[PDB]
Design a protein around this motif. Structure first.
Motif, PDB file in Angstrom:
ATOM      1  N   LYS A 153      -8.354  -1.781   3.402  1.00  0.00           N
ATOM      2  CA  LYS A 153      -8.041  -0.957   2.672  1.00  0.00           C
ATOM      3  C   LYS A 153      -7.568   0.435   3.342  1.00  0.00           C
ATOM      4  O   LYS A 153      -7.683   1.614   3.036  1.00  0.00           O
ATOM      5  CB  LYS A 153      -8.303  -0.342   0.844  1.00  0.00           C
ATOM      6  CG  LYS A 153      -7.876   0.011   0.381  1.00  0.00           C
ATOM      7  CD  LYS A 153      -7.568   0.301  -0.890  1.00  0.00           C
ATOM      8  CE  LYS A 153      -6.655   0.973  -2.091  1.00  0.00           C
ATOM      9  NZ  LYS A 153      -6.916   1.585  -2.925  1.00  0.00           N
ATOM     10  N   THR A 159      -5.759  -3.149  -4.462  1.00  0.00           N
ATOM     11  CA  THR A 159      -6.236  -2.037  -3.826  1.00  0.00           C
ATOM     12  C   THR A 159      -6.140  -0.960  -4.498  1.00  0.00           C
ATOM     13  O   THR A 159      -7.794   0.014  -4.393  1.00  0.00           O
ATOM     14  CB  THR A 159      -5.548  -2.155  -2.464  1.00  0.00           C
ATOM     15  OG1 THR A 159      -4.266  -1.845  -2.655  1.00  0.00           O
ATOM     16  CG2 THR A 159      -5.732  -4.147  -2.520  1.00  0.00           C
ATOM     17  N   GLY A 160      -5.638   0.049  -4.547  1.00  0.00           N
ATOM     18  CA  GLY A 160      -4.931   1.205  -5.097  1.00  0.00           C
ATOM     19  C   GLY A 160      -5.270   1.081  -6.581  1.00  0.00           C
ATOM     20  O   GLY A 160      -4.098   0.662  -7.490  1.00  0.00           O
ATOM     21  N   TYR A 175      -2.249  -2.404   7.803  1.00  0.00           N
ATOM     22  CA  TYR A 175      -0.936  -2.756   7.318  1.00  0.00           C
ATOM     23  C   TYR A 175      -0.046  -3.425   8.508  1.00  0.00           C
ATOM     24  O   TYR A 175       0.733  -2.221   9.119  1.00  0.00           O
ATOM     25  CB  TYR A 175      -0.251  -1.129   6.661  1.00  0.00           C
ATOM     26  CG  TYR A 175      -1.613  -1.671   5.379  1.00  0.00           C
ATOM     27  CD1 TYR A 175      -1.991  -2.091   4.567  1.00  0.00           C
ATOM     28  CD2 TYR A 175      -1.131   0.047   5.108  1.00  0.00           C
ATOM     29  CE1 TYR A 175      -2.620  -2.049   3.201  1.00  0.00           C
ATOM     30  CE2 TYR A 175      -1.743   0.913   4.035  1.00  0.00           C
ATOM     31  CZ  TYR A 175      -2.606  -0.479   2.835  1.00  0.00           C
ATOM     32  OH  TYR A 175      -3.032  -0.311   1.694  1.00  0.00           O
TER      33      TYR A 175
END
Lengths: 432, 116, 439, 439
Positions: free
Chosen positions: B101, D130-131, B106
């Protein structure tokens, strides 16, 4: 002539060797058939170092693939360049290693060793004069580690006056593949420090982090790591492959880079590690390369050299820039970063530039240096091995193989002596 | 059996911080099936422990406060952290769940995000 | 090369072998006739099928397995099937009298009568092969044919080939549900043989299968075919790197060498994943981390036991399908820091990475769906010792007044063997408890 | 990134969730099948749907919401709908017994039985993301399901996640009209839990919606559909800067941090505008100043409370549609000088500027027309503390002779909890009075 004989061991070693052979064939203009389609000048004179002259100009590889599992040769032969090697060099057994060093060295290392000895001899006397032998293997298994140490010992015993360099892969507690891996590492390190000239440190986790945080790859796999290590070795050997103004060779680097035979490990590294979209936005200059070869982000170490002091540095360049910039850069680095290298020995950085640029890239330079960062890996390995040997889990296999347990005792004794030596030479004071 | 019959359609995967959390056998007495481990006098470990104790005693003499082997340990740990090489951007100290994350994960180019 | 011979004893072993062979033939496109009649539209089959099948001069495939059972009814049931033209009648040995969950007759007065025939058959099969690694003995503890005959045969197989791996696959009597009554009678004797004369053993039950199928597949009326399908998928996943290749091939020896930490503790905990139906495999994103986490869930375990009761000594990790190394690394990084998962203060890490390029296939008419990748795990924990303890409790209570023992007395054995078995199991439980206790 | 998890308890919660999801799918062009079948004529959908939906490898969208109810009937009528192929059956947990306007059983003998299941579901959903920032819990005070089960779930959700926002959305028992009788009994217990265990709570009712629809929309026969549509529009307007962007993005944390001045006072006064049907949106020029002025009108509030009785502490205002900053500035300058609106001698100003470029959309068959821009306000005033006054009065005048309490006694609780809740509400009202009093 002066030729180099290349050796292969371990499935990871086999695949990285195949990748390196493909890379050098593409760089020097060799078709998958076996002929020559190159268009350069320095790709015909010194081409014989890794090839052999034959009829029709069809050069052949000089590499002996040693393995204990037949499944590796079929995989490596099916590739685009697997039909160009010598099938006679694919000496394979019938029983697997089972990731056992003792069993592989004892059972699968007695009746099969004769053929590989015979073929490496025949290769050696086929040439006039040689310099050394290159063996790319890994310590993660019983194939590369179980056999490479024995073969290196044999070649050193037969030909003491040769170069024993290797690129074995160091283990990592974070990224593991074998349950008994520390046992194999402890067994192999003894032979590496007793019967090996020099050894380079290879880690997969650090390369994964490097590609993931700098290259920004979608699905990075072992192929990328093989490409990176192949480029690393190509940059290493271009000092001899492509001569320039200030040429170097393997034995000079070994002598000038090793203060003591007990400590012969190094830290490899390549400079231009950028993302795909950053290839068209970059400034090609000396200080940027110096920063990328000095910082800890670009190096392939799963540790930090800043914990210790720099011992020996060799900056090998491959391109057409200058000579002053390198010396001024190293001078100001030694002046400012005074608390990072041994103060007792000034000028620990070596200058080396190759006027012949590589194929496909214009500026390139690799980092060969022995900094004080392997002590952490050594100490954690010693700790985990002392643990594993306390209650003796996973030992009955080795015991049933026939070899006793005192080997572990002497290996850990040598291990403790080595780490003590490393730590008391880390704080190299000038005087009392 | 009682849980399986009372809840009927229950397994022991139905684990949650409940009063019926069968880990509570060990919670009654952690010492049960545990052996005390005082600092022993193993010479194999003492070979390095003598050097470590010499270093700790030298540090204590240079400072002036009693330190144990553990106390020594966090002392040099804090010293190394304050030494500057704290490594906060690499796998030497970062937790395992701290790489997936991250915007560096990305790889999907910001072009499509611009389109969005 | 990597070739093994399968052993199928009892009706359960025979049906398991049949499911495995049909799974292999469909997954490699092998036609029931034994030849390749697909001359118009090809659908695969150009692979290394030599691991299980054999290639003749006429292009025929001969199965390499042993189908032995004391009762001829199962042999006749298989014979009238649609696959009778695949195998050979010489490999299906019938019998006049059978055991039927009796160890006495099947080990002394029944099994000892047909020994030379099966020995000659297995010797011929071994001679027909070049490279031998291990065996796949399929039997059962409840079944007397799969207990008495299996133990006696594996004794001579052990004494005849000490350098070959000896695997074990059978069914364990569930403490809740059961089929017969004399199951622990046979189990207490078969466990000693499988322990002191074998290298590894796999123990599974049916209650876990029922629970998982009703929970995920959501079926109200199960059948043995699905159970056999699950077991065959498990076996295929285990021996996946043998029939094909991949990034990291894991042979039988490669995983059995580490799967046995001690000669007395070789009972891994198998679990297959994903165990899902068709509709359960359409609107559910599948990654590696979730299923690996799901692998340690005790509801998905093949044995009714809490992993949290004990802790893990050794773990063997396997994969099959389009798997990316980074996902495996992320999963390992996740599992190593979980506080729920218990392990010893001794083994910081242990697992394997088996990357299989060939995805698992589907069966027309089955319940499994098209999953891009599969996964199997083999861990070793002391929490599974409860099953042996429940079995021992049952044996002691059913041995206090000698229930259903006079039959075994009349057939003719030593009564002290029961005492020997109970004391051996007591020693095994003591050693397991000692191992489970940490520093 | 900005991803939240919605919780739907009770029939009202389930229908609110259905309205919200259908509104999101129609506004984002999401087809009911779950894929993108529009291959001929595209009509949108190229945006950031990851906030609420999830993207599969096959181009499928999976909602991330929790649909729990003790009564299986509501789940049944949802399953037989046209959107059954969108969600997954595992997210719709049925039940044998239900509460149906009772706190006793739904909190002790009913809710306590299905706990680990919903905990596993929510844990899996959170791990799939994820968030995470906050949650969207949809329940009601009248419904015993959405009161007992909601309170019990939110307590463990609070103790398990402290760093995440905990929102609240339910329906208030109107003092004039009501559906059941024991509504105050559930409310008095639910309020304590929502106050001492949560950070923010939104309070609304139905007779205000009735008044606004009959006054503006001019309908003689209203229905729950429009009730749900208004709430869904409110929810979309609140979380507008999350799915899209604008000049000034206001996230959940951004407005939640300031919307709570004190730990005990977290009950904002929402107001949606414009609330008008088709004919009321054609020949009426719409600007920002008029609607902002109309926002403070009591006739447009969803709570029956005259704002002139108390005064405002904090105000949070949001915008959606083609809005121009100069109009907002002029509106602020106008309202800051209006003598009708009261505010403390302490907060000269406080507000937020939420500019969203995406205009609100319409629905085929609904009553809302096409409006170029919208506005929603969240203010904090002590004039709303009056509702709890009547709630306490009703609870007291019921509790004097113990009306409908022997049922709860028999179910089994402490009777002192009624005294505890009464005194806690008295203290809360005292604190509201103290804060409302200026110097």
């Amino acid at each position: 002539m002066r030729e180099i004989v290349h050796l292969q061991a371990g499935q990871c070693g086999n695949q990285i060797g195949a990748k390196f052979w493909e890379v050098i064939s593409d760089e020097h203009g060799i078709d998958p058939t076996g002929t020559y389609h190159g268009d350069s000048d320095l790709q015909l004179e010194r081409i014989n170092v890794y090839y052999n002259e034959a009829t029709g100009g069809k050069y052949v590889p000089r590499a002996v693939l040693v393995d204990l599992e037949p499944g590796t040769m079929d995989s490596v032969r099916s590739g685009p360049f697997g039909q160009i090697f010598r099938p006679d060099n694919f000496v394979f057994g019938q029983s697997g290693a089972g990731n056992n060093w003792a069993k592989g060295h004892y059972t699968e290392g007695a009746e099969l060793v004769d053929s590989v000895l015979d073929v490496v001899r025949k290769e050696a006397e086929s040439c006039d004069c040689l310099q050394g032998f290159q063996l790319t293997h890994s310590l993660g298994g019983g194939t590369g580690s179980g056999m490479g140490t024995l073969l290196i010992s044999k070649i050193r015993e037969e030909y003491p006056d040769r170069i024993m360099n290797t690129f074995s892969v160091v283990p990592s507690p974070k990224v593991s593949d074998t349950v008994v891996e520390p046992y194999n590492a402890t067994l192999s390190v003894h032979q590496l420090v007793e019967n090996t000239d020099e050894t380079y440190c290879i880690d997969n986790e650090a390369l994964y982090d490097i590609c993931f945080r700098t290259l920004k790859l979608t699905t990075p796999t072992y192929g990328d790591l093989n490409h990176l290590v192949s480029a690393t070795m190509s940059g290493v050997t271009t000092c001899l492959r492509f001569p320039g103004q200030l040429n170097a060779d393997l034995r000079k680097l070994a002598v000038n880079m090793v203060p003591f035979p007990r400590l012969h490990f190094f830290m490899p590294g390549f400079a231009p590690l950028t993302s795909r979209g950053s290839q068209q936005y970059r400034a090609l200059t000396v200080p940027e390369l110096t920063q990328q070869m000095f910082d800890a982000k670009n190096m392939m170490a799963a540790c930090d050299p800043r914990h210790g002091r720099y011992l020996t540095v060799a900056a090998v360049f491959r391109g057409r820039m200058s000579m002053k910039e390198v010396d001024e850069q190293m001078l100001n680095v030694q002046n400012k970063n005074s608390s990072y290298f041994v103060e007792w020995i000034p000028n620990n950085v070596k200058t080396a530039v190759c006027d012949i640029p590589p194929r496909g890239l214009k500026m390139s330079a690799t980092f060969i240096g022995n900094s004080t960062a392997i002590q952490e890996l050594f100490k954690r390995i010693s700790e985990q091995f002392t643990a594993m040997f306390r209650r003796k889990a996973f030992l009955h296999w080795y015991t049933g193989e026939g070899m006793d347990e005192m080997e572990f005792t002497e290996a850990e004794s040598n291990m403790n002596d080595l780490v003590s030596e490393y730590q008391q030479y880390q704080d190299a004071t000038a005087e009392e | 059996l009682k849980h399986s019959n009372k809840k009927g359609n229950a397994f022991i995967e139905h684990y949650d911080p409940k009063e019926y959390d069968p880990f509570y056998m060990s919670k009654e007495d952690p010492n049960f099936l545990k052996v005390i481990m005082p600092p022993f006098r193993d010479p194999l470990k003492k070979a390095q422990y003598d050097q470590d104790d010499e270093k700790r005693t030298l540090l204590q003499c240079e400072t002036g406060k009693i330190y144990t082997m553990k106390e020594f340990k966090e002392i040099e740990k804090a010293q190394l952290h304050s030494r500057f090489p704290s490594i906060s951007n690499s796998r030497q100290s970062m937790t395992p769940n701290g790489w997936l994350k991250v915007p560096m994960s990305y790889i999907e180019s910001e072009f499509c995000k611009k389109s969005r | 090369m990597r070739e093994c011979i399968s052993i199928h004893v009892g009706q359960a072993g025979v049906q398991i072998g049949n499911a495995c062979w049909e799974l292999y033939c469909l997954e490699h496109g092998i036609q029931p006739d034994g030849q390749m009649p697909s001359d118009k539209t090809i659908g695969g089959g150009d692979d290394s099928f030599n691991t299980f099948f054999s290639e003749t001069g006429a292009g025929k495939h001969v199965p390499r397995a042993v189908f032995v059972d004391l009762e001829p009814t199962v042999v006749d049931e298989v014979r009238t099937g649609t696959y009778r033209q695949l195998f050979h009648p010489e490999q299906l040995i019938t019998g006049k009298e059978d055991a039927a969950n009796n160890y006495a007759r099947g080990h002394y007065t029944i099994g000892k009568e047909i020994v030379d025939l099966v020995l000659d058959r297995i010797r011929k099969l071994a001679d027909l092969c070049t490279g031998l690694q291990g065996f796949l003995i399929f039997h059962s503890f409840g079944g007397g044919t799969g207990s008495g005959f299996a133990s006696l045969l594996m004794e001579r197989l052990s004494v005849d080939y000490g350098k070959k791996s000896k695997l074990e696959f059978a069914i364990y009597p569930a403490p809740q549900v059961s089929t017969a009554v004399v199951e622990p009678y046979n189990s207490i004797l078969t466990t000693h043989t499988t322990l002191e004369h074998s290298d590894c053993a796999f123990m599974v039950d049916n209650e876990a299968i029922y629970d998982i199928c009703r929970r995920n597949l959501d079926i109200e009326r199960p059948t043995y075919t699905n159970l056999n399908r699950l077991i065959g998928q498990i076996v295929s996943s285990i021996t996946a790197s043998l029939r094909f290749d991949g990034a990291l091939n894991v042979d039988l020896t490669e995983f059995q060498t580490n799967l046995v930490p001690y000669p007395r503790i070789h009972f891994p905990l198998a679990t297959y994943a994903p165990v899902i139906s068709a509709e359960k495999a359409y609107h559910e994103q599948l990654s590696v981390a979730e299923i690996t986490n799901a692998c340690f869930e005790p509801a998905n375990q093949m044995v009714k036991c809490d992993p949290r009761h004990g802790k893990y000594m050794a773990c063997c990790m396997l994969y099959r399908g389009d798997v990316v190394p980074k996902d495996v690394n992320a999963a390992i990084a996740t599992i190593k820091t979980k506080r729920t998962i218990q392990f010893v203060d001794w083994c910081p890490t242990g697992f394997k990475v088996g990357i299989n390029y060939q995805p698992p296939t589907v069966v027309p008419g089955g319940d499994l769906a098209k999953v891009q990748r599969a996964v199997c795990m083999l861990s070793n924990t002391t929490a599974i010792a409860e099953a042996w303890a429940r079995l021992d409790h049952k044996f002691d209570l059913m041995y206090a007044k000698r229930a259903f023992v006079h039959w075994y007395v009349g057939e003719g054995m030593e009564e002290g063997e029961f005492s020997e078995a109970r004391e051996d199991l007591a020693a095994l439980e003591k050693d397991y408890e000692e191992v489970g206790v940490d520093s």
